[PDB]
């Protein structure tokens, strides 16, 4: 019937002390972390029935954990497999889960959560069903509802209870819409947690003490949530309240503004579930939440995002692209060659991770403006309070900006970031390869030059490797490690560990002209320039770029990268093939150079720039390219950009440039800002949804529809054809 | 189709302003009862039992405007209990929609004599007080791309190329032609002054009028419910437009006022039996629509549809009356159909006198009956822009 | 000139008020679901030919405010030229939308029109819109406002209907509604409500208590601010009001929506539509607003005169079961044969969603006329404020 149920191991250890306070300790024996899986659901089922059977001898409940973490996440292996026809089962599972928590909530007696570590997603949903929360203020402990980052939503009462606690607007903005994670200090600050303790060993004693106190001091309110009290008033009002109803129509528009019109259905569903839930009783609200959850799990966006930010990402973090058998090797002193916006950004994220950096340039005047990049960033962090003055001084003191080459002694890690010129790098590497440590890693931040060719300018080619960062280095999370044919599996693994040590994610890439990121983002930019040269309105191109899910529209990105750099890449590719049919963008690139506009570096590009700030599209742009003369459908412009990168990613997978679809997805997402809803430029192929079908087969159908209209470059490779 | 519908009377109250308005103390029911009692004064021997229905438009029918205010007017004023009473809401066109529906009821033949019009006391029931799914429910709001009319109006001016001076020039033209009409006695017989239960005067003129408006004073105003991300939402659909030029202020947009209007409509046989004289004939009506993001371009297709329906062209029409919601909406309509300037809102419009959402359609409908009569002209076309991207138009011929 | 024909008439089930299945469904969704069913039946319909959408709604506030008809047009993806207008004539609002649709089609200035109504009384209770007749004390004191439940009891007092009598009609409505459901009468016209995932929410009328007995109806207590003294001030010859109406012999408070398609014969022929019934006549009348619920009798008389018909010419009579005495009064006035009156049960069993009832019982008779292979049906509702709406349909 309608029960707390529906072979698996028992997950919850039961203990009732001499006072009648039950301690439910969750300890799933199948892994290191308590997961909301079919095993837990069964265990919590039995335990809730028992709390009701022995209700006479029970005065309170405490929920604790035996793992390092409290309770984290759901059974993603199952949710990624739910088809649209499985929506019946999904709805029943989350309703059963919430029926248990609701019974625990209305037990007639206080329930306290003893949060010893990470309480994430389903884990925090368990604690929100309790009447009091206590958190052990320990390192690495986090609390939040990160379901929206996997394309899901807090379906175990997260949306309903947080809205009951904080109101519609605050619960959405602070907790639900972006799945923000909070350290226990910040958690208590916003009302997610109630009180803190120093160590975990104090939790259960402090919980049983709080139950003992609550029963005597508040006898009528024990085990009664604020929203189950008569006369409850939702913070900020209900949707019928006139104050909230005046601003409520702007919540879906403000969200459409933040997401730039991209097809992410998860934040949309969360806002809908929140507002509709706040219109009805708590039990009707939680059922609405179930339907919006099943609406997401059976959808394709959720499967993409679950594949990327869970399976693919965990495969990379676990050393999937790291060579097997190799051992760790510590890093003591980094040496950055060049103090440009890259070398300065490399000097900042290297020192923020605790490493002693030596930052050289061609002059003490330019190396000081380079370390000043780390100072102007440490001032934004002290003004906003994110760092103390003592840790901000220990950070900038590990940077030593110089112009001499002698003070490069003791460096066991060189990340060169000089100009993009081969013999220049051969010179810069030649004059340090012997006065730095003998067997140190030799790294280059080149964006197009083959690492094989650069490796011949040093003697120890086995320690020469590509270590490609992205600007701004402080905010971009990827590190593209380029494996030249002389690089050994140890240097590969050593830079792999260096990337994980500075809080970034590594992909490993075989050596090829353009690598992965630059080559792929080239096809993205060139698709927009071609459209501009075809007479399409620039405002439509930027709108197509923003509405496709990209973090920055293409013509805006074409200013950040120099248009002269693109011309250089095009001359290079033509040199190679001749020793090639040109891309239509190459005429736009040179034409823009001929007019003297080339981007932010020139203060004039597709946009106009007043005293260093971007300000509007260039008005002359429409006359130059006869803009408006071509008006294709917006979705055609959107698909032209997405398909150019997706097709180019398959070419890289075909050529051995990439070794896994995990690296192609996380690489495209974290490196070149490929839209997260796609799950990566490789997932986009197997998870395409359009009018005419869904899957890899429909991707080809749409690929040919685009190839028949805009050029044969949109023709799929054979590896996609059965 | 058989019976022809005729307008027999078309009166209205003065429009009282929103801030410190004279009409703020009058319940919107009493504004309607006042018009009913004037109709009894004009025709004391009218057999009210021949009035089969009372159709009042109302956009925010809550509070003092809820519970079917049309029927409340029927019972309060002492009309026969057989006279019905129904409220309707088609946003800004609810006043003209009540009149079109009354006419269509007469044409079907199953109704004889219908009272029609609207009421809106925006100083007591602010627009939005009724709520609504298109706004307050995020699931469908995210889909219909809801945008306040004030932003679609600015989008119109951005697309067609109407400068701030252009829209302020129309605003001045409206204030001028409204002040000319009032001093020339054009409104003497139709604007029924509002009084209290003692017969003391409350209002006898359109308080919102600023007849001393100057083109320099309009340029001093600041552009204008719109404080979220609505600008970015609109340009997501209108992706070829880079920036929205916010040209609309409180001096070139429709004023927020209280008011009510009544129109008496019946068949040829209906008025003859009661000794009434038909003043105009309802030639044709049409509703259409356009994109609801830029929701105010509705008047253009609805006017074309009513001209093809009545077998007429733009040249055949003597007077055009489009509701002055926003100055750009009128300039667009004028630019689209090449409306001659000397034949457009020739007594001023809502920018000067105000726009009582529920009552405006019947107010400007009755404005053209009097101007057709005063000019001895033949045909007038009345149209309004509607929220949600709708359009409503009506052709009347003088009799 | 033109003749108005009914081409489709569908309705959602009616979910009850306490712990209702539809309580979580926004009323806008109910209407959209019916629009999508019309699409399923006629996928090649040119929706551009739908010139208007006319919905009745007694409480156009909250989830039902802001012209819910236009919201249904945009949310369902219908053409923007399809109009959309809400109207409120209290209980008759649903049928009034259908009448107006027909009269619009007869005038010639509309081609194809959707009409109906929606009322989610569990989300938007009646009275949520306020109203002058109720809340303004000057005009409340002057129209002698009295809730309908008292007028219904007053009707039973004057006409001599006992508690047994009103209860006996209640038992009969439950029996006839249950027999219609089990007979499959409603299979094609009641469209089950589903969620965004296709999971079922409701596929039957939950307010039905088909195991009703005369003994259980007598166990109920009557609904009974001094409105009783107000009524007897006008009906001064009546000494005391006999309070016979309970929740068992009065209309149920439910959620539901109904949709009807109406057009000319030319409009239907252009879209491949087969007409199911013809709108013969409509009439609006009224009676004393204190007793409030005697409007059906004069409205039905007017429409029979206007159509050149009499009681003997009508095969089926369907009057909204607002209260038991209202139907008994109507049956006594016009001497309606018992076997012609509310043959498939009514609002006492299945519920009375204010804005939608008129379009529901209208569609119930289009179906029953086709099933019995009969000719005519007269549909009427008592209206708050003393009004009355009647309509005659003829099968085609
Ligand atoms: O505003 C009414 C229309 O809403 C939807 O269309 C809007 O949203 C679409 C999705 O991005 C856009 O393509 C479209 O341009 C917008 O108008 C709905 O799809 C339409 O059927 C409605 O008419
Ligand atoms: O003033 C109280 C009177 O109330 C009733 O009169 C009203 O009857 C209708 C409304 O119920 C309308 O015609 C109008 O509002 C009143 O005439 C009652 O009939 C009278 O006897 C009372 O004096």
Author numbering:
A (entry chain A): -14 to -9, 1 to 573, 578 to 720
B (entry chain D): 1 to 224, 229 to 403
C (entry chain C): 2 to 225, 232 to 403
What does the paper behind this entry write?
The Mycobacterium tuberculosis trifunctional enzyme (MtTFE) is an α2β2 tetrameric enzyme in which the α-chain harbors the 2E-enoyl-CoA hydratase (ECH) and 3S-hydroxyacyl-CoA dehydrogenase (HAD) active sites, and the β-chain provides the 3-ketoacyl-CoA thiolase (KAT) active site. Linear, medium-chain and long-chain 2E-enoyl-CoA molecules are the preferred substrates of MtTFE. Mtb is capable of switching its metabolic preference during the latent stage of infection in order to utilize host-derived fatty acids as a source of carbon rather than glucose or glycerol. The Mtb genome encodes an unusually large set of enzymes of the β-oxidation cycle; however, only a single trifunctional enzyme (MtTFE) that catalyzes three of the last four reactions in the β-oxidation cycle is present in Mtb, in contrast to other bacteria such as Escherichia coli, which has two TFEs. Here, 226 fragments were screened in a crystallographic fragment-binding study of MtTFE crystals, resulting in the structures of 16 MtTFE–fragment complexes.
14 (out of 16) of the characterized MtTFE–fragment complexes involve compounds with aromatic rings [the only exceptions are fragment M-1 (the anion) and fragment B-B3 (trehalose)].
